[PDB]
Amino acid sequence: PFDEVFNATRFASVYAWNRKRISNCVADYSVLYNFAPFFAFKCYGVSPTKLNDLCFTNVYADSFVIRGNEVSQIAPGQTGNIADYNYKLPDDFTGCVIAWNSNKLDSKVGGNYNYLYRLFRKSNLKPFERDISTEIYQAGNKPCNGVAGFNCYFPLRSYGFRPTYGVGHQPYRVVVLSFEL
Amino acid sequence: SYVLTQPPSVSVAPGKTARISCGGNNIGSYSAHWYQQRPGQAPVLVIYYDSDRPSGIPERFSGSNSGNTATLTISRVEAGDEADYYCQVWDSSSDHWVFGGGTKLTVL
Amino acid sequence: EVQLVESGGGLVQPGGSLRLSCAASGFTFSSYDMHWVRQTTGKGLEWVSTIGTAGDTYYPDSVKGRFTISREDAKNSLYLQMNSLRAGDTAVYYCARGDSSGYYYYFDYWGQGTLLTVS
Amino acid sequence: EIVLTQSPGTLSLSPGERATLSCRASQTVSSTSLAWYQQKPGQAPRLLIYGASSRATGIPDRFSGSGSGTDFTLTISRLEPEDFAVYYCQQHDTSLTFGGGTKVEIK
């Protein structure tokens, strides 16, 4: 079951985060119990020891690449760009989070300018919603419908992922399993 | 520390194209951005990520950042966009932004 | 109904290793977890480490790597091998027992505590 | 399709040295799909390295693995009388294209 979530070759960007529908599996937990050292396995809700006793039917598996110093915004209840615009996690969260350093997999010497996030937006995200729209978006008096210019901004930017950086700026691959019956 | 070099004044002719180059040592490793400075209007971005274009800006600007030097070039100038231009490079060893020294552009 | 005891604690020299021997009995030791809680006299209680019935060494941020949990199911014992004992780890170490009601986690009947002077 | 050429194909060495291989190609493939293989004269092949640096189950401590970009290299440390087989390259970036072969012999 836990084959294409962890050991895949490509992870989509934050503003177009992936979403699986794993179902009709058995446990596939003796694998991540042996995951060590997978940086952080700070899961929330049910205890990690008591995982082979529940009967989840819709085990989700999100996945993306973010900066290391921004994985803290995945915890239920936070403030930030990735907590308000890109991906939302409700306060009453009932699921686990797994994160690990993936510098050796996605860090080009020139720079992988192929990871995107929305810097600006007028209205914060609702729980469990996508933000795939890329329309021009502005704040002011000029409607500037489609027409670019001042006060009308394009809400996309790219990550400067490089090998010879710090741990905080180094990419981290985060997979959150929002367990839900 | 990571001092950059830049010409003071363009000393250019109207109609033709002009080249502005930021000197230094090993700039190609990092990324470079560029700015425009009137005698004060809260300076606005014109070039970022080596050779990418901010939205809503004239396309006659360009960008090149290859190894020894990074270059911003203007072609078919309008002779009105005569202002100051600055380039910057970020650092990864210690968090320390370094800025340019000055470029005066004026066409008569 | 489970009686827990601990042994092996001592005023060992700094930087050495030490083996707590909580051992104990009265329950199916191969069915429940058993944790360790550090009781410093001033800063309350903090959870040292834990082990499950899978060989899964879950560790806190500071304790990770510098410690080691070891579950021997043949004879009752759970070693807590020290590594580079810091001068701040002068507290009482109780071995506890886990429990649950499906979702929530409770620290069930504790035992007693030895003393580490890290000196 | 991406052509994956490995040069040379004939190697002559004594019973024990350190050997170096090569694997060049066209437009850069990802550093996630560059598995190498070993094939003894006779029996079927087996996995040696995946992800350009990862030893498989039962792989001895004599294989390093490395590479990122367009040029890639397998470096073999020490030689044994049961390590003198042919070796292959493989990619999964664009469909699946194999290599030709790189064989190392005695003497």
Add this chain to the structure above:
Amino acid sequence: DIQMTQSPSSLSAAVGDRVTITCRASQSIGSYLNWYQQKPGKAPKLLIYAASSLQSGVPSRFSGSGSGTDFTLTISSLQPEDFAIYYCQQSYVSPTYTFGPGTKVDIK
């Protein structure tokens, strides 16, 4: 990461009272609480879990309820064997378990 708190630490009450100790937590927790009683010298002992449940051997006087970011156990019929300190706990963050600060209920 939840820094849960309480500070009616220096509680004073003579033998026999109905004083109430309140434990109010940080960023939203929900119904995640379990209680402990600690005698001096002896070992900590858990009394009430889920903030409203019952464990065998725990007298009914240590009753209480509550949910969300608010918690409460009512202590009726105070007795000399209700000495020393008391402890909260959260269980929303699974690996790094947190423990309550501490409150002392005395005899005077």
Add this chain to the structure above:
Amino acid sequence: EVQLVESGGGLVQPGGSLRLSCAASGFTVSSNYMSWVRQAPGKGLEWVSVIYSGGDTYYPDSVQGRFTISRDNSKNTLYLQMNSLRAEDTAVYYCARSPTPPDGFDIWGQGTLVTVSS
């Protein structure tokens, strides 16, 4: 609409402390990588200070210790408790928002002026 505003000017003798209370509109200050950028009276641009989302603060070489950067979420205001003033710091000060550090600066404030002279 982003209209970063700088407040607090006046004149101060060498040694006094002035609080340059910036402003914000449309974006939370305690969610971004806000930073201070100076402008000498006719010379090259320079950097001042930076506050991270987590809270880490880094400073340049020439300005170390004398300068402190805070952040009040309750008022959407970012402060700059500048102390131990010298005679070579009379400049116009700008509020700059960097989306992520490996990038440049997109939003620039109006810029208030302080006169460090007698």
Add this chain to the structure above:
Amino acid sequence: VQLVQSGAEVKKPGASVKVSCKASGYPFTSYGISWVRQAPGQGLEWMGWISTYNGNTNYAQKFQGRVTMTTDTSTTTGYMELRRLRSDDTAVYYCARDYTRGAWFGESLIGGFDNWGQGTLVTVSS
């Protein structure tokens, strides 16, 4: 680990040869069966990605309309039935585990061909 290959076979040009492969010792699902061809002293060329639990297939380009590979879940046994046997088809056909594209979704993974089998030689010249 235990991957068992079928025997050899002799045939005439223009026939239809089928090669079987039975493998066991591991859960059949959550893994892919891979097929590889090796002409005498020539090299390797990819042959297919018969996968389980979905019936999905991915054949190479040189024979994009010539090979059909079906799964026998009843015994975790795989077969390839090559068609229109040509003159230059005499080769060794290798049955190996596939860890490149996965089983459930279509997406590449870090890995390769884990365990191989024994091998079989199809004799088709005359």
